Design a binder for this molecule. Sequence first.
Ligand SMILES: O=C(N[C@@H]1CCN(c2ccccn2)C1)c1nc(C2CC2)ccc1Nc1cncnc1
Ligand SMILES: [Mg+2]
Ligand SMILES: [Zn+2]
Length: 313
Amino acid sequence: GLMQFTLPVRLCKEIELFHFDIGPFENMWPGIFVYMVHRSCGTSCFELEKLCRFIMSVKKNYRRVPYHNWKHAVTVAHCMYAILQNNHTLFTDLERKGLLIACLCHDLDHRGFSNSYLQKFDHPLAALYSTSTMEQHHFSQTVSILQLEGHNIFSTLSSSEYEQVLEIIRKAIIATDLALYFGNRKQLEEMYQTGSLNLNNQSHRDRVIGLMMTACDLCSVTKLWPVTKLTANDIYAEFWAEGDEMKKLGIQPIPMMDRDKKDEVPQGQLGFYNAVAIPCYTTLTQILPPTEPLLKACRDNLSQWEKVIRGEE
Ligand SMILES: O=C(N[C@@H]1CCN(c2ccccn2)C1)c1nc(C2CC2)ccc1Nc1cncnc1
Ligand SMILES: [Mg+2]
Ligand SMILES: [Zn+2]
């Protein structure tokens, strides 16, 4: 109860900003995450003995892959923290609780491969879940860690409060399947443009929480350029691994995943910002106007990729 986590001044101040980078020191991330649960939720939401043991089980079930790692888990949890703070009153007490856990858990036990490479490889997880293959695996993995003796952070919730929170988490986690982002955003654009959009409509919140999860999941494009540029290296380390695996199944992989086609990266970043990132954050600022900074940073990084092509860095 009477324990606070207190970060250093620079972190204390930088963490409130959308663009915050959680730094290269693995052994502070668990504390940065608690810091965010207490400031976002209450020093009450969870018992610190339970939360810590949940965090270190979650850390342990991420894998040492180039991008879909523990670092990303917590990066994506901080973007949700930033969204939750600058929209204090739009979100229920349960939703703040669920969504930060959601974010921390959203890529649990990823192996560095797309839902696509699972199906072409005929991995068992592709027989168990026909679509959002990894994302259903990640939710399953979260339900599993919550059920370890001593790990149920949600134990001090009514039967009903409990079922709501695992259902927020479930949908949140499914929504980080980029294949369900496209339809979800078209609907939300249409719903705020035609004015029908209703945040008391539970099914409409669902869509809005889904957008946030794509926004938080993609939040690596919203960072300062050096951060975004060095994160891009890690993201293509996985994509190119996957490409090599595709090639060993005797399948020419898409250019995104072909390490021969490095030359095509800047133009591939271009389409990705235009086709996915700008629309994501555009729609998200339209619906939660204090999220504007993510659109402005994303815009800025687009311009930085425009400069790489023009042959100026
Ligand atoms: O970059 C992404 N996609 C584009 C799509 C065409 N493309 C090409 C195409 C040809 C050659 C080279 N690249 C690359 C991208 N994709 C995803 C999921 C969709 C899997 C998540 C993040 C991404 N970006 C990113 C992440 N973290 C920091 N910075 C950026
Ligand atoms: Mg994922
Ligand atoms: Zn992710």
